[PDB]
Each structure stands twice: as structure tokens, then as C-alpha cells.
Amino acid sequence: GRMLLDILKFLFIYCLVLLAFANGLNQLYFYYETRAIDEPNNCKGIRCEKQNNAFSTLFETLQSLFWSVFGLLNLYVTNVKARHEFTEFVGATMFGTYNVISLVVLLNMLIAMMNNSYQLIADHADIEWKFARTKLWMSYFDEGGTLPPPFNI
Amino acid sequence: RDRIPLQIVRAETELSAEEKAFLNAVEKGDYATVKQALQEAEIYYNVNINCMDPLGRSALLIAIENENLEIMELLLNHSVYVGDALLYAIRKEVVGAVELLLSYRTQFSEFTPDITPIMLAAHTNNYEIIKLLVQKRVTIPRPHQIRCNCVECVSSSEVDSLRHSRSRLNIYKALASPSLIALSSEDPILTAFRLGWELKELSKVENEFKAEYEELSQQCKLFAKDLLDQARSSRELEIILNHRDDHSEELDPQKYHDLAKLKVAIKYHQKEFVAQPNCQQLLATLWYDGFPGWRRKHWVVKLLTCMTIGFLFPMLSIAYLISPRSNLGLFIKKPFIKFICHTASYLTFLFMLLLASQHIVRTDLHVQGPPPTVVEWMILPWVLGFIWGEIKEMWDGGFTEYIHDWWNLMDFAMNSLYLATISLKIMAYVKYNGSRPREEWEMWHPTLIAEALFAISNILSSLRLISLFTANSHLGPLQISLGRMLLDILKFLFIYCLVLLAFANGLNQLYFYYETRAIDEPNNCKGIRCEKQNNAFSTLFETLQSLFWSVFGLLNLYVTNVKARHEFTEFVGATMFGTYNVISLVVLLNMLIAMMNNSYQLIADHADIEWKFARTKLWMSYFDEGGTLPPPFNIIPTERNADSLIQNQHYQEVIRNLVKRYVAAMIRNSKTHEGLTEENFKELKQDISSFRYEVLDLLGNR
Amino acid sequence: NYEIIKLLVQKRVTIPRPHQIRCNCVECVSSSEVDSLRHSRSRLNIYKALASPSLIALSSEDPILTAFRLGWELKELSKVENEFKAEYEELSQQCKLFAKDLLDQARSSRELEIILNHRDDHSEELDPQKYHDLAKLKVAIKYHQKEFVAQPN
Amino acid sequence: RDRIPLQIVRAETELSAEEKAFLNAVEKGDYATVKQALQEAEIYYNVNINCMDPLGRSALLIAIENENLEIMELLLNHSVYVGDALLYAIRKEVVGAVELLLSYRTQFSEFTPDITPIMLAAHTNNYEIIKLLVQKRVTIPRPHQIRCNCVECVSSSEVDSLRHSRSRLNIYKALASPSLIALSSEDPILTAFRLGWELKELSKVENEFKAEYEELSQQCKLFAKDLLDQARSSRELEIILNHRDDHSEELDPQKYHDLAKLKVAIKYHQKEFVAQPNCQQLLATLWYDGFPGWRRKHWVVKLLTCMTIGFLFPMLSIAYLISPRSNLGLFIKKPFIKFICHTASYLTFLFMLLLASQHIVRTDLHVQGPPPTVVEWMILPWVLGFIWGEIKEMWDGGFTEYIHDWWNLMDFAMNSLYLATISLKIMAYVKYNGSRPREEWEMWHPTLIAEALFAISNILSSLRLISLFTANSHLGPLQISLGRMLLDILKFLFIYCLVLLAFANGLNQLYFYYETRAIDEPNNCKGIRCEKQNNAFSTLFETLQSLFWSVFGLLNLYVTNVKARHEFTEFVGATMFGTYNVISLVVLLNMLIAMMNNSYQLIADHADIEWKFARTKLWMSYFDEGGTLPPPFNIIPTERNADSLIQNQHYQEVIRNLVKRYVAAMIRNSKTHEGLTEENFKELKQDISSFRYEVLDLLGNR
Amino acid sequence: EVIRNLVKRYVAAMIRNSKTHEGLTEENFKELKQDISSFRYEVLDLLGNR
Ligand SMILES: Cn1c(=O)n(CCCO)c(=O)c2c1nc(OC1CC(C)(C)N(O)C(C)(C)C1)n2Cc1ccc(Cl)cc1
Ligand SMILES: Cn1c(=O)n(CCCO)c(=O)c2c1nc(OC1CC(C)(C)N(O)C(C)(C)C1)n2Cc1ccc(Cl)cc1
Ligand SMILES: Cn1c(=O)n(CCCO)c(=O)c2c1nc(OC1CC(C)(C)N(O)C(C)(C)C1)n2Cc1ccc(Cl)cc1
Ligand SMILES: CC(C)CCC[C@@H](C)[C@H]1CC[C@H]2[C@@H]3CC=C4C[C@@H](OC(=O)CCC(=O)O)CC[C@]4(C)[C@H]3CC[C@]12C
Ligand SMILES: CC(C)CCC[C@@H](C)[C@H]1CC[C@H]2[C@@H]3CC=C4C[C@@H](OC(=O)CCC(=O)O)CC[C@]4(C)[C@H]3CC[C@]12C
Ligand SMILES: [Ca+2]
Numbered sequence A: 001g002r003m004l005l006d007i008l009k010f011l012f013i014y015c016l017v018l019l020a021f022a023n024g025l026n027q028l029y030f031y032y033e034t035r036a037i038d039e040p041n042n043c044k045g046i047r048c049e050k051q052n053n054a055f056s057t058l059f060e061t062l063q064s065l066f067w068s069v070f071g072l073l074n075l076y077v078t079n080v081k082a083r084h085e086f087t088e089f090v091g092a093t094m095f096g097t098y099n100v101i102s103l104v105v106l107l108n109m110l111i112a113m114m115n116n117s118y119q120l121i122a123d124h125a126d127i128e129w130k131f132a133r134t135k136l137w138m139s140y141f142d143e144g145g146t147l148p149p150p151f152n153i
Numbered sequence B, D: 001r002d003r004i005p006l007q008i009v010r011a012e013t014e015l016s017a018e019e020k021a022f023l024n025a026v027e028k029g030d031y032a033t034v035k036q037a038l039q040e041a042e043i044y045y046n047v048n049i050n051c052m053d054p055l056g057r058s059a060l061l062i063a064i065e066n067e068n069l070e071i072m073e074l075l076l077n078h079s080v081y082v083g084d085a086l087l088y089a090i091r092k093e094v095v096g097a098v099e100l101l102l103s104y105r106t107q108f109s110e111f112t113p114d115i116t117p118i119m120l121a122a123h124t125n126n127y128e129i130i131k132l133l134v135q136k137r138v139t140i141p142r143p144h145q146i147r148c149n150c151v152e153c154v155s156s157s158e159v160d161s162l163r164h165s166r167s168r169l170n171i172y173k174a175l176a177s178p179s180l181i182a183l184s185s186e187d188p189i190l191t192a193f194r195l196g197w198e199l200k201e202l203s204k205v206e207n208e209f210k211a212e213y214e215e216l217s218q219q220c221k222l223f224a225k226d227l228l229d230q231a232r233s234s235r236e237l238e239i240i241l242n243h244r245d246d247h248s249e250e251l252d253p254q255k256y257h258d259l260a261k262l263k264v265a266i267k268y269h270q271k272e273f274v275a276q277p278n279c280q281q282l283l284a285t286l287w288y289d290g291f292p293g294w295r296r297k298h299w300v301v302k303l304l305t306c307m308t309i310g311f312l313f314p315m316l317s318i319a320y321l322i323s324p325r326s327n328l329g330l331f332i333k334k335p336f337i338k339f340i341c342h343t344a345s346y347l348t349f350l351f352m353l354l355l356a357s358q359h360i361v362r363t364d365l366h367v368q369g370p371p372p373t374v375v376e377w378m379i380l381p382w383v384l385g386f387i388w389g390e391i392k393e394m395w396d397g398g399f400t401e402y403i404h405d406w407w408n409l410m411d412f413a414m415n416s417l418y419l420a421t422i423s424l425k426i427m428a429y430v431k432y433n434g435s436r437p438r439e440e441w442e443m444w445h446p447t448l449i450a451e452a453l454f455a456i457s458n459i460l461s462s463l464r465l466i467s468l469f470t471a472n473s474h475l476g477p478l479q480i481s482l483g484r485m486l487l488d489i490l491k492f493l494f495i496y497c498l499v500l501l502a503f504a505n506g507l508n509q510l511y512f513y514y515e516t517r518a519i520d521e522p523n524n525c526k527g528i529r530c531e532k533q534n535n536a537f538s539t540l541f542e543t544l545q546s547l548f549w550s551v552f553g554l555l556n557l558y559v560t561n562v563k564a565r566h567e568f569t570e571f572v573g574a575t576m577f578g579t580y581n582v583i584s585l586v587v588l589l590n591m592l593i594a595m596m597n598n599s600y601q602l603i604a605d606h607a608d609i610e611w612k613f614a615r616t617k618l619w620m621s622y623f624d625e626g627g628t629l630p631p632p633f634n635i636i637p638t639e640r641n642a643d644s645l646i647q648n649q650h651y652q653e654v655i656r657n658l659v660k661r662y663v664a665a666m667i668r669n670s671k672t673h674e675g676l677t678e679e680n681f682k683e684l685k686q687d688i689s690s691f692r693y694e695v696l697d698l699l700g701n702r
Numbered sequence C: 001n002y003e004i005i006k007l008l009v010q011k012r013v014t015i016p017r018p019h020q021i022r023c024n025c026v027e028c029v030s031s032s033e034v035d036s037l038r039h040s041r042s043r044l045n046i047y048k049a050l051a052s053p054s055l056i057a058l059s060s061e062d063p064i065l066t067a068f069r070l071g072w073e074l075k076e077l078s079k080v081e082n083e084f085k086a087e088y089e090e091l092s093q094q095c096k097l098f099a100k101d102l103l104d105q106a107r108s109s110r111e112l113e114i115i116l117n118h119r120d121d122h123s124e125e126l127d128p129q130k131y132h133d134l135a136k137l138k139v140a141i142k143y144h145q146k147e148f149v150a151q152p153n
Numbered sequence E: 001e002v003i004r005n006l007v008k009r010y011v012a013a014m015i016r017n018s019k020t021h022e023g024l025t026e027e028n029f030k031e032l033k034q035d036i037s038s039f040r041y042e043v044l045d046l047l048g049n050r
């Protein structure tokens, strides 16, 4: 729980990166949005068996970039029906650049910072835990909440 | 053959037994015995007063070694050979012995031939001894510039490179001595700034002795920081930081005009000097000019204040034009208020970038040369201000310094892409006059290119916001540390680049025979971006992309199969792909993690000073009154030596007090810092021995 | 130095009382106007004297309570006065150590019971539903005296 | 109210001015002044000889403080109050003062009431002072057992828990003193073994003071190791390591019967003692009995030699059965030779496991009750030997000690699975007497269960080989360190298990409404192991598997959709899955990496000593005569007081010399180990002051 | 009463803990040297047959 405060700071930089690339990808792909009736099985989005419309809207784009962190977004979502070769390559390069920044650079930077921060936290773990356990114990010394929730009403 | 006989291989001349006892008396402190032996040496001529043990230490060196001044005079009175005794006395740091040797008037030495009494005294950093020598009109050779091709510099390195390098380092060790700088430097702070900067550059040219020069440079930086630590009042700090070394060159208006010495420290990269708490405290007062109690305010009132100022940025900008001298027109000039207004004027620009794709008009997807939309028109004035502001710096700051900042590279690319989008949009508007279905557009249609260029600029514009993390106490230190880790990562990418090319060449060499046509692929799609990936290694360009995507696991294994089903070829190609995965994902990826962890540990101990230096540069960029208006509004159209002489007199008085306090503190800090050594124990023992012999001498008839 | 401090205290000496951290009085504002550097250094010098374990042991009616409050006040000061945060954090740590070291000198369970159950003249009304004892231990928890609470005894 | 008035809150009784000067004379070393003041106080009664300085130090304590023995006798001769002076003299460690106080023989004290002169002397670990007190018939209280419920232990704990805990720790600090053990222990090595082991157990029960007891235990382990370091010949080392503390055991002919003290050290976990280089060197000589020059041989001849003996294991085992006394029948008894034969006999078993699936007989996949094949028949004797060997440890080693070793848990599971396979195979052979297509077999067909159980045993059998890495110098240290990291990882899996259950419950609670039938799924396949994954969160059991597989990225995103296409439900379920991925893969996974990196750094400190201890246990298991035959061949069917007294006499003589050498070394190591303190500077200053005053008594003129 | 005893024990321990600091400085060497010099001068001042 002491390592979570440091992790939260790093999540500020990643959010800026996610928004920067989400805006760029949506700005490029929103022209080619298709309708659900025109998709196989009538399913629209990235939660379909055949993912589509990954970057059609900003809300959808943010989810697509989130899921690519875990490798659940297929590469073929960067293609459009009209097969505009230059547009598809540019969109795939934005997606590729985002993957490098988030998974090769930012992910490892968080690991390095976590390792350094855990070393400092580890030398005060005993005193910190004992203080926490003392608060836990003292909350049961009082005779106010003796009855558990089932019987306290 | 079963025993190793040991003998003296390089034998020196042996010392007589009479001399052995004579030297033992000097070590014991036996003044009476030494005096008599000297008396005998004047008549008998049996013992050699100038006798030296193979170690080279004569009686004079032994007398200096024990700090026994009374005996040393005894030997000096007897005309003993001096030679290099002054250097030994200076090294021992015995003020009494140095004065005696100064008042007095193929051998082996412990010092190189280039060492002089003044240079060695500066190496020891002894204020008292350095003052004694400087009072006797001493000088030190001036080292030539680092990149010098004169006859002396070239010839000296030709005759003896080893001696030439050592002589130069000895001179710089003396010049970098804090005691010498405090004593002989007219402006010790400026001297430490320039000397430390020069040493850092020398540590790069002199690859072999980089560590030595880097320690001297660090020593100069510490001295300037420690001098500033001795300031005792705000008036003293103001005098030091606002001092201008020269006044002849005219100072152009529109600039801050103050903190001249602080700006010099920033130019020389004096991070410790800039990060000094008293210097930082003064800067915060100027930065928060309109908020006397900013630090005392709750984090909620601070946030509420920021939003109110930001939403009012359009109104404050208008006031600065309509009535610059009015009460409202002066708020924008406060550095922190101006910073919020610029940030607000940039957040509005980024918000409109989102609105570019949030609004869609049906039937407008097919206009080949569409004119600017509503959002584009509002964005246009912002872009012109951004381009105008960047050119305003190229003609003002200079080409050289601009490119050094990495954030300026992103500003140049962002503005170039925005200019290309506008020109491309104009060509499409003129070349086409109707609407055609987008499916029939060519690959390089101008409208398609403009849309791609515009989208790339949007990513760069959003990423620019990260530079604002420097202003925050929580995010700034982390953001600065992250940028320091990127240079180490860039070196690692060199090894991975060669690995990627090596395997890309091998895989393409194996698979290019089996390239197929798009007409023969399902859905008529060729490449790895299709639903059914194919032709992964058909061409070198495609192969490089396939290996890049496999780093993230987005390349399926079945791409290693060919239609003809050549079993041996497919297995070899899959083994190349497998070997590449092992090298890049199991070995190289983990090596980068290990290297990053080690490098972050070192960076973490200097994060505070590095961030404060970065934030100081951010603050100072808003002190000037040049770029007050944010981008949206920045395009709308007898004898005067008395002041300089007095300003210099006050600076000299403050410098005099700072040196006095610093010298006392350093003399104080030595007596309570380090423990004893054998030299102290030997000296204490000799004191008792000398006292014992002298007391025993007062006796009767023997 | 305990011996020297006793000599001076016996001669009717006094120390200036520092104003609260968030003070807007004429003296605090005016002094910070004429000389901010001297004002900051003067305040730190006073707190260095007040945080001295020897002075607290000699002149404090309740040294344990004084160390609790003084150390807590210094921790808050290290936030407002961020330029000299390290100096104030070291003083706060020094106060925490003194209270813990005083508790280390207890030689019997009766002595420990007396110290930990002491009420600083509360009077007032105590809730029967609450826990009556360990008044000083609860004060230590309130001031975040983790080393004091984690003491083995 | 703007000033804090400082006053003495707890004021003590003031000391008169006459007493203040009297104490100053003692500190100065002024013997003459002290003598007059004491003599004057015998008549005038103006000064108090026992003047209690508020600090509690009287003149006697000041005299002891400066080690001024002559003055000490001056005050003692005057009948000054002694009180607790002996403890102060003992703490100062001044032998002269201690003898003086011993010879003649509520106030504030610096010592708790339980401290006695002998206990405090042992705390200081001063051999000379401890000998003086022990010679005067002193005793120390015996601490009760760790878990004692007697009236005294319970009453003391309730009466004063704080004092009871402190008293017990003080006693153990005295008993753990190396000087006291060397002086008063009949068998110092055995005493250090038991005392250190007892302290380690106490550090767990008394968890509040765990660090204190762990340091005492480490101190006992070091003392035994340091005693062994003083051995100067192989004969001395042999006597120490082969000493039997007690007799009448009658031993066991199957047992090794030698290295009795080494076995005791292993039992008490004396890793440093076992890892001593001289102890290790002796063990290697026994381990390599048949190879006098094993270390001098090239790594190729070693490897070539190992294969030769390994391939010859079948006939070496036969020779030991036919002619045990023959030349060839004695080779198998050498520990290293026996280890290779057992390893070879196990590698053969693993090779046959591979052959189980390498031979496939067409038309034999449908026999319901098939009999054992060729490979199975050969494997059978190996399995019976393995089961027989493990049961042989039940009756020999005992139930309790077997379960301690984690490798025995894998041996038990492996043998149980093999037994279940044999019984299941027998039932199928008897129940079914024909052939039937395997497609119609039921889910729980006995033949199918036997095949699964057999395959699981094969994995466990192969993993057993990892335990052989301990014998290698390169792999053993790493394998041991890896096993030490598994206990820290197991704690982490507790937090992940809670997270997995929390999200599994939430996801199943949301998706169980939309469960579909296998008939309605494509290919009639239901679950996440189908080509088109479905019903991922239909049941709790399925949900747990789905979340497990998503850790490796094997669960597709489309499993979050339901047939009815309830948009809000699908988004909520996908957000639960997304939140779980963040917590487990971005947060918890990295936290484990950080924890592992920190724990591995500490483990690497003791890798060598830990591996050597593990390898010693491996070697000793082959010294015995019991399990000589590998599993394949292991199933085929007066008065000694005089000899024990001499063995004890030799041990005592060696122990006497080891203590003498150890005591001198420790007395030697102190005079060069630690630097000077303030007490040394004060002592030196007082010496000069005393000399100055004494000399000044004889004033020739004034 | 308890506070009084705790302070007495604490003060003694801190005064004790400094004398065993295990360190020396130049100011101690200077003081020790000066003691011998002062003693030497005082003894020498009482000269005999001049
Ligand atoms: C960001 N990025 C990307 O988006 N794609 C997908 C494009 C659309 O499919 C790529 O293929 C792509 C790419 N960075 C690429 O190389 C970089 C990769 C990283 C890890 C940053 N290091 O280490 C260096 C050494 C700088 C090489 N490559 C592969 C590539 C290289 C040359 C050529 Cl000519 C073609 C492809
Ligand atoms: C590079 N490489 C590869 O390309 N393939 C794909 C071939 C085409 O499908 C493989 O299967 C393949 C492979 N390295 C393999 O083992 C290595 C893996 C690493 C991580 C380098 N360590 O740890 C060692 C211990 C050296 C084993 N194996 C598996 C394998 C092993 C034996 C046999 Cl007989 C067959 C396969
Ligand atoms: C848990 N989680 C998730 O389940 N999904 C899938 C939903 C169903 O598809 C998401 O898309 C999703 C998500 N956390 C998201 O951002 C998080 C990412 C992390 C690194 C955890 N940091 O630190 C914070 C600051 C908490 C933001 N995003 C992306 C997103 C963002 C905004 C919007 Cl409006 C829409 C999506
Ligand atoms: C509307 C879309 C385009 C997103 C806009 C971006 C904002 C969500 C964030 C991203 C980074 C933020 C900035 C990050 C850092 C700072 C420095 C911060 O500095 C201070 O004045 C506080 C210093 C301190 O308290 O130590 C003020 C807010 C600001 C400009 C933040 C303002 C809000 C920003 C621009
Ligand atoms: C699944 C099976 C069929 C394949 C694996 C078996 C062998 C390829 C390897 C795996 C581990 C090896 C063992 C690992 C460690 C050792 C200890 C090693 O010890 C020594 O005698 C050398 C000590 C040193 O030189 O320091 C001797 C070989 C041996 C038994 C090795 C023998 C060969 C083994 C069994
Ligand atoms: Ca710029």
C-alpha cells in the first residue's frame, strides 16, 4: 500500500500519452466509421469476434489503446474498407509508436522506480506494520461495536 | 632448487654506524645529542651532516617531519643542504617551518620537477601558507586553451606527452583551490563559475584523465555554492545575485535586466548554486508576486484560484492591449499569472483539437477540396501565433541554443507539420472543385495527406503538455528523472537495431522466393495488417515491420508457412523467427531493464537539484516582458560610470565578508571532521621524548 | 550540552516564542518583508533550540507530551517551508527519537503502566462506551509517533 | 506571551561550593589536593566525602572513571560509601579497580536491579575480569524452559512482565559470552551449538525482542566457527570432528559411525561451522576416496570418467551382490562412485519414460484393459525399488523428519501416483476383456484415468533431477538461491488469490444469467478451450480458469459479449475484466518483481555458505553403508569405558589448545580493531595533569 | 516521579554514549599537544645554576 502512492504519480504521465495518441488516431480514422448493420454478425466495436471500428470515436479509441497494453487488440484493426494505403500505414505507425512508448519505455520506467522505492520502504516495514496493527487492536478494545453486523442492528 | 635465495638486487650505498645514531637522535627529539654531534662534525669530519637514508630523508627532512622547529633551526644554522626542503615543509603544512625556510633565503625527490612552492601550497589548500607565499610576489603559468596548436603546445606534447599532461593538470589543481581563489581572485564567484566550466570541457577532451578534471570541476562548483551559503541578510543576497560584471555593453530593453549573476550561473550550469535554498526563496517571491501567502493556502483554494485565472485569460489578455497601465492590464505581467494564462490559452487549443473529429457533417466526406470548417477557422489564429512565436525566438535567442533543447525539436516538427497541412489544404481547394466518393481517391490524394499530417501534429501538440510537469513539485522531479533515463535507453536501441537488421536480412533472403500477389490472397489483402496475415517476409520493408510487431506478440506463427509447403524451408524460417524472439524478448529486453534499474538509482540522488534547476529556467522565461501575450493574442499588432562604480563597491564589500566567514568555517570544519593518523601519534610521542631528554639533561656530574 | 544548559537556565533565561506557521500579524509580515532570509534563519534557530532533548528534559513539565507536539509541529513546518524541508524534518525526527528513548528507560511494568495511562488533566466527560485507559498511547497514535508505539515494551 | 521562560522543572538538591572544588581535584588528578580535603573532612565536617553529584557520580565513581588507581585507594581508605561501585568498575573494564573492590569487600543506578557482577562481566566479555570473578565461586540463575507454566514463571510474568523479560535476556547475554563459555564450559563447542540453537527458538516465541535473541544466537555460531579455525593439524581436526559426547548408543552397523560432532553440527544447523574450509577439505577427501587427484584433473577427463562409471553401474551393482569383498565389489561403496551409479540408475529410468510414448502400436489404442507393454515391464522394477526405498526411510528416519524436506513431498506424491496407476491398470485389465473404439469411452474410464496419472508422475520424476544441481559448483549455488526465493513468492500469491476470487465472484455474478448450452455453440464445444471461446464467466469454476488464463493473454476480448447484446451489461463486464488486468498485470506483477529483486540481494550474501551446507548433507547421505544398491537392484534380496575415557582425554587436550589460541587472537584483534574514543582522550589528559601536579609539589623556588 | 527517574537514566546514558563514540578529531590532538607544551614550559621555568 505504500508503493501505490508512487505508482499513482506515474499514471499521470501515461494518461497524457494515452490522450495524445487517442486524439491523433481518432482524428485520422473517424472518417471511415461504419455501421453495425454493415459488419458481420451485426457487431460493432473491439469486443466483437472480428474487431472493427477501433478508432471511429474518441471513447472507442481510448478503450482500444487500453486493451493493446495487454495485447488484446489485433493488428488488422488499422485497416479501412477503402484500403487507403497511405492512411493505413500512418495509422499503424501511430499505433506502433504508442506501443513502443507505453510498453517498452514507460512500463520499464515504472519497474525501475518501483524497485528503488521498495528498497526504501523495506527498511521501515516493521515499524510501519506494528503501528498499523496497533490501530487494528485498539479498535477492538472499546465496548461500542461489540456485536457483529448481523446482530448490531 | 627447492629454496629461493633472497638478496638485494639494486643495492644502494650503505650508511655508516655513526650516521645511524645521529639520525636516531633527531627522530627521538634528543636536542642535546643532535647539537653535540653537529659540534663534532665541524672538526672531526667523521659523520656526514647531509647524510640521507636510501629513503632520501636527511636530518632536515626528519626535523620537518616531526615538526620540531627548534632542532630544524639547529641543523639550518650548521649550513645543511636544503634542496627541496620547502616543498616538504609545505606538504607537511607546518607554518613555522615554511617561514624559517623562506627567511633562511640527480637527487631523488618525492615531487615532480614541475611542482613549485605556490602550486604545491594551493594543492594542500592551506589558507595561511598560501598567504605567506602570495605576499612574496609569486606567479603561476597560464595554461593555453584546450584546443591550441601553437609551437610550444605541439612541441611540448611531442617531446614529452606524459610530462606535458601532468604539468597542465598540476596547474589546474592549483587554480581550482578554494583558498587561492578567495585570496587572489577579484570576483571569486565568477572565477569559480568559469574555472569549473572550463574543467568540465577539459575532462571531455582529456579522455584518459577525465575523472581528475571532473573532480576539480565539482570542487569549483562547491566553492561558489558555499560562498553563497554565508549570506546572512536578504540585502547581501540581492547584491550578489544582481551584480553585473560589465556595464559598457548596452543592455537592450524588454528584458528582465535583473539577476545578472543568477543568469550567468544558469549559463555555466551551476545547478547547486541555483538550487541554493535562499536563492530559491528569493525566486519564489518574484514568481508569486501577486500572492504573498501562496504557501500558506490550502490545496483547494490554490486549485480554485488557478481555474478562475485561467478562465479569465481572454479578459486579461485584452486588458494588456487596451489599457496596459490600467489596474487590470498589469496582472498579466506577474510571472505566475502569466504562466497560468499561457497554459489556459494552450488548454483551449488542445480542447478544440478534440472538437475537430467530434463534429461530422454527412455528405462532406466526399468533398475533394473542402474549405476550412468552423473548428479549423478558430484553430488557425492559434497556429499562426505558435509559428510566429517560434520564429521570434530564432531571430532573438539564436540558432545554436535553440536546437539544444529537445522540446524545441518537437516545436519545430509540430509547426512544420501544421504549415504543410495548410499548404496541402490550399492546393486541394484549388485543384478540385466538386465531390467524389472517397473510395475512388488515389493513394496520394492531397486531402488524404493533409488529414494524416494534421493528425500527427495533434499527437505532438498534446505531448507538449508534459513539459509543464516541471512546474509541479510532485510531477516535476519524476518527469525530469524520466527524461534523464532516455539517453541511456537510446544507446541500447543501437544494439537492438543491428539485431533487427541481421534477422530481417536473413528472413527476407529465405522467404522472398515465395511472394504471392494480392489478387491471390483472401479478401484481396496482402501483408501482415490483414485479418489473415500473409507475405510477412516477402520484402525487406515488410520483414522489418513483421519483426517489430512480433515484439508485442501481434505476429501469428502461421506466417512462417509457404503455399508450396516446403517443410525444411518452413522449419528454418520458423527457427530464425524463434531465435530472434529469444534474443530480443528474453535477453535484450531484460538487459535493458537491468541497465535502467542501475541508472535510475544514480539519477535518483540528484533529482531534487536537477528539478529545481529546470524549474528555475521555467520561471525565468516568464520574468521578461517580451512574450506576455499568449499565442492567440500575440500576433495582433554627463558621466554614467558612477552607477557601475558604486554597484561594484557594494559587491566587493559583500564578497569580503563572505570570504571571511567561509575561511573561518573551513578552518573550523577541519578540526572536528577527521580522526588522527600515524603522523599525529608520531608527533605526540616525539613531544614526550623531547621533554624527557631535556628534563633528564638537567643533572649533576656523570 | 546538559551541563552548560543547566548553568544558563539557572540564570533566568528565556527564548522567543515562534508564531504559528500560518500567521499574518504585522510583525510576521513586516519582518518577512524587510529581510526574508534573516526571518527564515531566525525561526529555524529557535526551533533547533526548542527541539534539543537536553532542554526539553530540563525545562519541560511533561517531556513526552512536549516531544510529541514539537515533533508534529516541525513535520508540518517542513511542508510549508519547503525550501528548508530537510532541516525541519531532521528536527522532527530528533523529537520522535527522544520520546522513544525516554520510554526505553522504563524498568518495571508499573512504570510503563503509569506513563501510558496518563491523562494530561483532561477533566471533561468520558464516554462509557469508549476505552478509558491508554490515554497517552492514544495521543502518540494521534501524533503519528510510530517509533514510540512500536517500542517492544 | 511572546517569550518562553525557561526554568528547572524537576530541581534536585544543590551541591555546596566546597564539594564542587573537591570533585574538580579528583577529575584533574590532583592527588595532593584530594588528600588534604579528605583529611580535613575528618575533623571539620565541612565537606561530604560521599557528595552525590546530581549525575549520581561520587568521587569514587570519578576515580574509577579515570582509572586513577592511586586516588581510588585514597578514597577507599577513608571509608567512602561503595554501593554499586563494583559494577561501574567492571563496566569500565579496569582490572586494577575490580581487584581493589574485591579485595576489601533508593539511590540512582545506571544498572537494573537484576544485574550481578558475574553477569555484567560476561556482558563485557572480558576474559581477565571474568576469570577473577569465577575464581570466587560465583553462580548464574538457570533460565527455565522456553515454554514453562510453573508457578514462578507465571507469577513473575503477571507481577512484572517487563522486568521478567529483561531479566531472562540478561541471563542469556551472559551465558552466550564466548569468554565465559571458554572458561567454564566442559565442551565449549557443544555448549555453543545448543546455546545458539536455543536462542534461535527463543527469538520466535519472544517476538517483541526477536532481534536481540537473534544476535546472541549468531554470536554463539561465530564462537564455534572461530574455535575450529584455530586447528593447526589434520590430527587436531580429526579429533574434534569425530568426538562422541555420549556413549551406550551401540550405534548401527548400517550407520557411518564417524564424524559424530559434524553430524551434531548439521542437526543444530551450524552452517558456518560446517562450511569451514578445513572441515570441507576433509569431507572432500572422503567423498573422492577413489580419486586422490580429482581437483588436478581437466574438466574433460572428469566428464569422460563420469560417463564410464555411469555406463558401468549395472555390473558394479551386481558385483556388490555377488562378491562384496572382491576388488570390484568394493568400488560401489566409495561415496562419489556410489552417487554416480545412483544418478546413472535414475537417468536410465527417465530415458525409459521417454520410450513409453515413443512406441505406438496401431490398433492397440482401443484395448480397454491392455496389459503392460515392453517399456512398462522394465519400468516396473524401478518403481518398486523407489517405493521400497521411501518406505525404508519411514521405518529408519521417522515420520517427523521426513516431511521437513520439500523434496520428500515430491517423492511421496510421485510414488503415490505410480501406485494408483498400477492399481487402476489392474482394475481395467480385470473389468474389460476386449477392444472398443476410444471415442465411445466414458469420461471416467479407468484406462483414461491411469494414463493421466502416469503422465503426471513423469513430470514429477523429471523435476526430481533438479535436486542433483546441489552437487555442482556452478549450478548448486544458483539452485539453492532459487529455492530460497520461493518462500517469499508464496506470501505474494496470498494477495493475488484474494484478488482473483474477488473478481471471479463479481464476474460470475454478472454473467451467470446468460449461460448457453453446448448444443447451441458452434462445433458443440462449450468453454474457453474451444476454438471460439464462450461461456467464460458462466460458472464460478469456469470464471476462475478464465481469469487465470488472461494472465498469459490467452483469453480473447470477445468473451465479454452476450448473445442478447445487452450493451450496458457487456460494458460493465468488460470493465471488471479490464480492472482485473490492471491490478494483476500492471500492479501486482511488478510488485512481485520489486520484492524479488530486494530479497535476492540479501540471499546472495549467504549463497556460498548455504550451498556448502546443502552439499554436505548430500555427501553424507552416501557415506553410510545402508542404501548402496540403486533402486533397480535394491529390492533383490564388552566394556568400552577405557576406550571412551581416552577419546575424551584427547578431545580435552585439543580443546585446551584451541581456547588458548582463540583467547590470544581475540585479545590481539581488539588492540588493532577499534579506534580511540572520548574516554581515551580524557584518560590521556588526566595522566598529564596528575604528573604536572605531582612534579609541581617539588618547587625549587617560587 | 516516573518522569524524573526516566530523565535521570536518559541523561546518564547519553553522557555515557558520547564517551564511547569511537572517534577523535584534530581539536583533541591540538589540546593534548598544548598540555605537554604548557607542562614543559612550567618545568623549564624552574632552572637551577644559571
Ligand atoms: C514505431 N514503429 C512502427 O510503428 N512500425 C509499424 C509501421 C506500420 O506497420 C514499425 O515497423 C517500426 C517502428 N519502429 C521501428 O524500428 C525501431 C524500433 C525501436 C524499438 C524504437 N528501436 O529500437 C529502433 C532501433 C529505433 C528501431 N520499426 C521497424 C522498421 C524499421 C525500419 C523500417 Cl524501413 C521499417 C520498419
Ligand atoms: C530458438 N528456438 C526455436 O526457434 N524453436 C522453433 C523451431 C521451429 O518451430 C524451438 O522450438 C526452440 C528454440 N530454442 C529451443 O530450446 C531452447 C530455448 C532457450 C530459451 C534458448 N533455452 O532455455 C534452452 C535451454 C537452450 C532451450 N526450442 C525448443 C526445442 C528444444 C529441443 C528440440 Cl529437439 C526442439 C525444440
Ligand atoms: C480499467 N479500464 C477498463 O476496463 N477499460 C475497458 C472498458 C470496457 O471496454 C478501459 O477502457 C480503461 C480502463 N482504465 C482506463 O484508463 C485508466 C488506465 C490506468 C493506467 C489504470 N490509469 O492509471 C488511469 C488513470 C486509472 C486511467 N481505460 C481507458 C479509458 C479512459 C477513459 C475513457 Cl472515457 C475510456 C477508457
Ligand atoms: C482538455 C485536454 C486537452 C486536457 C488538458 C490537460 C490537463 C488535463 C492537464 C495535463 C497536465 C496539467 C498541468 C501539469 C502541471 C501544471 C503545473 C502546476 O504548477 C503549479 O502552479 C503548482 C505547483 C505546486 O503546487 O507545486 C499548475 C497546473 C499545471 C499547469 C497543470 C494544468 C492542467 C494540465 C494541463
Ligand atoms: C530427462 C533426462 C533424460 C535429461 C536430463 C539428464 C541429464 C542431461 C542431466 C540433467 C542434470 C544433470 C546432473 C546435474 C548435476 C550433476 C552434479 C555433478 O557433480 C559433480 O560430480 C561435479 C561437481 C563439480 O565439478 O563441481 C555430476 C553430474 C550431475 C549428476 C548431472 C548429470 C547429468 C544430468 C542428470
Ligand atoms: Ca519552443
Ligand SMILES: [Ca+2]
Residues within 6 Å of the ligand: D390, D407, D408, D411
Ligand atoms: Ca526421499
